[PDB]
Design a binder for this molecule. Structure first.
Ligand SMILES: Nc1ccn([C@@H]2O[C@H](COP(=O)(O)OP(=O)(O)O[C@H]3O[C@H](CO)[C@@H](O)[C@H](O)[C@H]3O)[C@@H](O)[C@H]2O)c(=O)n1
Ligand SMILES: Nc1ccn([C@@H]2O[C@H](COP(=O)(O)OP(=O)(O)O[C@H]3O[C@H](CO)[C@@H](O)[C@H](O)[C@H]3O)[C@@H](O)[C@H]2O)c(=O)n1
Ligand SMILES: Nc1ccn([C@@H]2O[C@H](COP(=O)(O)OP(=O)(O)O[C@H]3O[C@H](CO)[C@@H](O)[C@H](O)[C@H]3O)[C@@H](O)[C@H]2O)c(=O)n1
Ligand SMILES: Nc1ccn([C@@H]2O[C@H](COP(=O)(O)OP(=O)(O)O[C@H]3O[C@H](CO)[C@@H](O)[C@H](O)[C@H]3O)[C@@H](O)[C@H]2O)c(=O)n1
Ligand SMILES: Nc1ccn([C@@H]2O[C@H](COP(=O)(O)OP(=O)(O)O[C@H]3O[C@H](CO)[C@@H](O)[C@H](O)[C@H]3O)[C@@H](O)[C@H]2O)c(=O)n1
Ligand SMILES: Nc1ccn([C@@H]2O[C@H](COP(=O)(O)OP(=O)(O)O[C@H]3O[C@H](CO)[C@@H](O)[C@H](O)[C@H]3O)[C@@H](O)[C@H]2O)c(=O)n1
Ligand SMILES: [Mg+2]
Ligand SMILES: [Mg+2]
Ligand SMILES: [Mg+2]
Ligand SMILES: [Mg+2]
Ligand SMILES: [Mg+2]
Ligand SMILES: [Mg+2]
Lengths: 251, 251, 251, 251, 251, 251
């Protein structure tokens, strides 16, 4: 079925958001690893402002990733502890100014003839069963599927009763309504809902789909973390450092 | 009763967060205006890193705020359309590294002999009835009162049913549980719960109080906006520009 | 007659363009000195982005300009070699985004009831007879007068004949058509030609005036230099350093 | 005859001036395209400060220019919509401090045995008939030929008569004397007029040549734009965006 | 006798070197405190590049140094825990480019009619008996006196014998030859040895004096630390923080 | 015997210290040249923060080092005046935070089975007889050998007698005790003295060795210069420019 993952890496800026690291590696790579362990090895990167940074990275992938030896005499570069990644990574310049829907539209070409394809934000990691979501999408037959998740807390949480605060928790790990965690599974017709570069995916497209009854939610009550804040960064880095990263399911 | 407002303006950095403007004026000033219209005119500013910026501002208040004429010959500076503010503004250096509880402790001196005092974050504005909260605090007799509010949305909101997303809304204006909007009313004993500079208010102090049944919530279902993001900034600036700022209740 | 000089100091940015120095003093001050020696001592500064820089300067004029002694015990600051300037300097915030015409409009208030007033760019100096231009404007009775000047060369000048370059001169001191050197003398009705903040003076207003036959040119074949480039800067600074600044006509 | 184009890309700084883009491509590339459409495909780039930037660009030419796919498994990079450029591009480090004449001297080696060669500034584009200028140079038999052009306006243009400004135009498209538009055609003996690194081409060399009657002018009354200012940049970018770039004569 | 201290605060840059802090106060202030406790309360500051920073500081001395209350209504600023300093502080602009001797020459005016005066670097602190050095200078009758000190270690120290390193110490607290610790006591005739702005004190002037037998050394085997490196900074800050600063001899 | 040189290039930051240039080449390269002329052609670079900069350099060695021609049509890059370096250069990421001993430990793998190996700082050059030091180390049979040198002066040097400064010299070329000039020759057992990443070589390891009588000193009374200061930089660059670099012993 679906075999390609489209990732958003444009927007604000410096380097692109997905280039921010964790454990010395761009978050973008962490997400690629997530898909890859779920058998998805074809990637399309929607680049924007500072995109070349992303290009340079992949163009010098091993140099970035490992220790090397330059055998000058032979004009050869030896990679130590080389860990090959059987990926196809397409880097598409999608516009310095495009919106999320716009970027997707831009890459239509690359997924236009697939049953379904995966699409996600370049800043969120999780221990999500990618395969599961695919099968789920196939099963429900809708045009689209999103991964619903519990968000990080950004404020001081309150347990109020009778005007009395029974309990107080500073930025707790989200426990009410699930939100858009990204990790979409989509049919290529969704692109038809995108008008142009200025289209924001989370706007008309998504609302319409929900509206049309064409949008399903795969609920993921488990680990999911976006990297928006420094606190996020630190949190994520700690997890990684401590050897306790729930999204790191690979060898 | 309570007649002094303690405001947090330390932390991260550049200029201090409260110095970020809206309509050409630091948000900090907007908050001061909020209190001032509710009769609170004594202020204590907990300064940290880049604090001098805040000092310079108040030290050159009118120069910052209005058009002026320097009558050089007479060594006089004339202020056009001068709008006097009958305030007492104390600027206290509370530490480059202190935590929120730490900063409060630092300024104990200044409120230690008051029935109660006001305390708030230097980054949130609202159309809150300050007087109301005071009276409310007096009435309930607890050690502390906080203002509960509906937070801004940071993610794509979902209406799910039977795995189907009935509706999708990108970062909607918060509609479930109220959170810590700040705007506290406190008795000086709360300070006793603060151990040192590294104490984070939202931690032990607050949890304890709730825990001890010493923490009440004044619910404010209306306008409240923190300035955390640029989107926040833009939103706030628009409101201000458009002449539609709910927190601007003054003349 | 005319007794006030309106100076443009908004636009791009860092510090405001007029704040760039020559001989350790902002060019703006050099221009003020030019007017001042011609008896003009009332100034209106149209401030924009970074305007406060200008405000701080005038607010700490002597501190900026001379050596000082702080008699701490007496809370007194003594100025060495103090050189008083009997000026009235109005600093008006004219908008971060306004155009030149827009800024002028903004300050209408300040010259609205004068026979005529002076207006100029905050980046050009010259050995112009200010009084002369005033009298000239009074004499011709038109709504407006501008100072026409020979511009600095920005390219390699050519003397061609019969396809042959007879002579080549790199960025020569301008010798054909005079251009807008600024230094205007105007009647307050010109303001009526300004629609809003976005009005660029050099556009509709000026073209109309010329068009209406309401615009005269006081030709200044002598010294006039704008500070646009670094080369300009260096040139100007050299002149100043060498004690050969044609615009420095004061004591 | 002449088959190599020498381009100046040193001087001030950040990235080199010629690296500034238009339509996402360095202006330098636009100029190369100009020559290339006129059959000139051998280039010599006089690099200076930040030169490596230029080197990296050419070294990763397609990566910079197009969308790519990294077939990781095969260690292959696939270029989408590849547009080959049959050029030879020599990058010579000509000194961080050298002057224009100095840089040329530096590259003598590369054109020393040619009938004639082309030389130009890395910041100006035009719809110039390169071939035409070559033939013209061959025809006149002089040591040197330059392209004369109408410059952009930097000031407010005036139509004065009898002290009256008949018309006013803000920075009009130049209509008097033609200037040095660059785009030279030269015989290698001109190098003999260059003494060292500090030689500025537009100085002694050029003046001498004119002086010696060895300098001809190919007048180009048409499109020619240098990129000196941001206004220039914007103007150029607009033209390009609008699909109305007179210098873009290629497919 | 000597009653004025001349301090060097020009050179490299950002803020001036002497403005770098320790315990939240510019090192410059620490040195002033050193003199002040030894009865020296008249200061002359040789300012250079970024000098205004120094000016602003003294101009807003208490605002910088303490907590304040702005009694807006009364246009009054109240200083908390005010600690008056009965100093006279002259700030002289001595040139962005001048050398140390040059700066001194610049301020001749200010000490020209004193028996002797003090002169020092704005970056070194110590527990030196200032009075002692004065008396010493008076006693020896030479034109000049310098304070000799043991310098901080910048390298790995070695105890070698017979090619064997008996002991190794990383950047130890200096134990061989004393160096120029500054803290000079001078007669005004030394100025005659200074030719111009480009004169470096430590060059001709000092060598000559030694040479002429006009230079004495007051040896200070105790505490003396220059702030050149960050390590220096950290070291100094630690000392200060720990309440173990040997130079802090005041109340 | 010893055939590999381990070089420290981590620490503070921007680019890595060893990347700072002299004569347009990173100092690191100068040191490599020093070893290389002494027959040492196997290198191990201990990288830290900004390490990739070092990686990119070696990965694009000739592009950095020489003039090139890109034969686009053939996808070939031609190097002019190519000067091959028969080196093996290993780049190991040794930690953003590691200490000098820590970094060495990190690379143990690479020298663990050698009789001895060379180790040095990436910021010091000299006309040292590398071979000599090796033979010397072999001869003395100790675990370690260091190169002792005379350091640059950082202060004003004094010749005192009887309280009188007989002579004064500003930052003279060091003439008392030799210091740690680096350029070590070591047996791999020294690594056993390194506990972790936080180990500073110059601490426990070195002191112990000296202490244990396992540390010898090869005294180099000749040319040795570290690049710590800008003055250092300038000095070194001058030497290089003037064609008088004592460390440049190669062709
Ligand atoms: N014009 C833009 C903006 C963003 N992005 C990319 O999209 C990803 C996410 O962007 P973001 O973090 O700024 O977006 P968000 O504000 O966090 O919100 C998005 O991500 C949230 C989950 O983290 C969703 O709940 C929300 O609905 C969705 O809009 C990033 O990798 C970014 O590079 C992009 O390609 N183009
Ligand atoms: N060490 C620190 C950190 C912050 N602040 C000040 O405190 C205010 C708020 O700081 P922030 O925006 O970083 O804090 P927050 O993450 O937004 O969270 C705070 O504000 C939220 C409401 O906006 C609350 O719900 C939450 O419980 C409370 O911790 C700012 O004016 C800041 O200058 C301070 O004085 N010292
Ligand atoms: N929005 C803007 C732009 C500029 N300025 C002020 O106007 C002065 C001149 O601005 P500029 O140097 O950018 O303007 P220009 O491009 O040099 O052109 C102006 O000045 C030229 C003479 O120097 C005139 O010939 C020309 O007609 C007139 O438009 C500066 O002090 C600047 O601060 C301003 O207040 N607001
Ligand atoms: N030391 C220098 C200075 C400049 N350049 C290069 O030369 C080109 C033009 O430099 P520029 O824009 O600073 O020069 P200009 O002031 O615009 O003037 C030049 O270009 C003008 C046309 O644009 C000519 O009329 C003029 O005679 C000629 O000197 C740029 O690509 C620049 O990188 C260089 O290699 N080395
Ligand atoms: N052109 C210059 C350079 C420096 N300074 C001032 O002089 C002081 C010392 O300058 P520095 O630290 O750069 O000087 P140094 O290299 O440390 O050397 C000086 O200070 C050393 C003691 O710290 C002396 O031993 C040495 O002889 C003397 O030259 C600083 O406060 C600096 O602002 C100045 O006014 N003008
Ligand atoms: N954590 C650190 C610090 C430094 N370095 C590297 O080590 C070299 C030297 O570092 P530095 O100049 O900061 O060290 P130092 O303060 O100059 O001192 C070192 O070098 C001195 C000789 O220059 C020795 O006398 C001294 O004992 C030794 O510690 C540089 O190439 C640097 O990149 C490193 O890999 N990791
Ligand atoms: Mg996000
Ligand atoms: Mg906040
Ligand atoms: Mg101008
Ligand atoms: Mg140009
Ligand atoms: Mg020093
Ligand atoms: Mg070093």
């Amino acid at each position: 079925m679906a075999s390609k993952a489209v990732i958003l890496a444009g927007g604000l800026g410096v380097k692109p958001k997905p280039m921010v690291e964790i454990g010395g590696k761009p978050i973008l790579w962490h997400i690629m690893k997530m898909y890859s362990v779920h058998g998805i090895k074809d990637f399309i990167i929607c680049c924007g402002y500072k995109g070349y940074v992303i290009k340079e990275y992949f163009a010098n992938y091993f140099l970035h990733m490992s220790d090397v030896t330059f055998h000058m005499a032979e004009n050869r570069m030896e990679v130590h502890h080389k860990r090959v990644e059987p990926w196809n990574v397409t880097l598409v310049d999608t516009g310095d100014s495009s919106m999320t829907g716009g970027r997707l539209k831009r890459v239509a070409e690359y997924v236009k003839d697939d049953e379904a394809f995966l699409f996600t934000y370049g800043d969120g990691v999780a221990d999500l069963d990618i395969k599961a979501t695919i099968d789920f999408h196939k099963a429900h037959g809708k045009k689209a599927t999103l991964t619903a998740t519990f968000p990080p807390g950004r404020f001081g949480a309150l347990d109020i009763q009778a005007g009395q605060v029974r309990s107080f928790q500073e930025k707790p790990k989200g426990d009410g309504a699930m939100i858009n965690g990204g990790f979409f599974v989509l049919n290529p017709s969704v692109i038809d809902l995108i008008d142009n570069d200025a289209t924001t995916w989370e706007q008309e497209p998504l609302m319409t789909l929900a509206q049309q009854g064409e949008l399903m939610a795969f609920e993921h009550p488990g680990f999911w973390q976006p990297m928006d804040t420094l606190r996020d960064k630190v949190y994520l880095e700690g997890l990684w450092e401590k050897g306790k990263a729930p999204w790191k399911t690979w060898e």
